[PDB]
Every structure is written in C-alpha cells, then in structure tokens.
Amino acid sequence: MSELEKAVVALIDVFHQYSGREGDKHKLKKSELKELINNELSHFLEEIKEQEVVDKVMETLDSDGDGECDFQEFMAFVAMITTACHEF
Amino acid sequence: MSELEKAVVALIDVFHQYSGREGDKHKLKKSELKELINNELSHFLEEIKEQEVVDKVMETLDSDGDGECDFQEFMAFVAMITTACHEF
C-alpha cells in the first residue's frame, strides 16, 4: 500500500520476470541481465550493445563467482544505481 | 517510466522524506527510522512501540557505527526486507 512497499514488490517482481526466463529461475544469466538493463533501466543506463559491456557488468555484480546474478547481487546493483542518483 | 525505475526513485524519495526531518538531512536518526518503519512498512514489519526495538534495529542497520542510518545502510535494510519475502 505505501509507496515504499510498492517499490519493494516491484524489485521482486521485475527480477523474477527476467531471472525466470532461462536456466536457474532464481538467477540472472548474462542474456537475462542484459535484457533487464536494456528494457527496464533505459533512463538510468546506456543501452548495452557490446559483449564486453555485458561481460564487465556481470563481472562486477557476480560477488559469489558463480557466473550469474542472484537476487542479493541484484539488490547490490540497485543500491549502486540509487546511490549514483542520489549523487548526480 | 519503467516499474523498476519508479521503484528506484521511490526508495530515494521516501528515505529523504524521513532523513531530512531533523539533524543531518542525509541520515536517519532513531526517531526518523522509527517513523519510516511505522508509517511506510506497516504491511511488512510489526509496528515499533518499545525503545529496545528501536535501539536494536538501529544497532543492526548502522554498519559504520555513527549511530544513524545513512542511505547505503537504508539500502541494505531494503535488501533485508525484500529477501525475507522472496523467502516467505
């Protein structure tokens, strides 16, 4: 009901809309992450068109080193974005 | 414009609505944190009525030990809530 509570559910909703596409339904593989950024973060982040940019973003977000972005890693990503803007 | 982008701005908006009330306008003191939880997280978290609960929550969220909850500490709090529900 609150605007914060709506944001919490939206974070959960959008992660899983993408993570559930292929393979592990609870983690983002590179193609899932790329589509999430391109479709859902177009006002905040430049569209990803090059493989090396995909690779680098995943390298940055994948803290436990399994090659995918899980929900906790996604939340760290959201923290990164939000802080850059609170800042800009 | 996207539902994710709306969530990112809502997180920024609600933090600052509370953090900007008293003292440091970029950090939540205990009374600011308590009001945020009570007013904005009523579907997710039991209302805070006892001082020891205020104290404990702050103790948990205040990683850099300055006695307040800053925006990065708030994002960790949001991560905690979101993960509990993805889980429930």
Ligand SMILES: O=C(O)c1ccccc1S
């Ligand atoms: O600037 C960003 O928010 C960012 C985006 C993707 C990967 C790393 C970073 S640090």
Ligand SMILES: O=C(O)c1ccccc1S
């Ligand atoms: O259960 C929670 O989400 C929580 C809330 C306030 C402080 C610590 C925790 S772990």
Ligand code: EMC
């Ligand atoms: C960069 C203003 Hg949220």
Ligand code: EMC
């Ligand atoms: C506990 C369902 Hg978001």
Ligand SMILES: [Ca+2]
């Ligand atoms: Ca997946």
Ligand SMILES: [Ca+2]
């Ligand atoms: Ca990972």
Ligand SMILES: [Ca+2]
């Ligand atoms: Ca304050």
Ligand SMILES: [Ca+2]
């Ligand atoms: Ca602190």
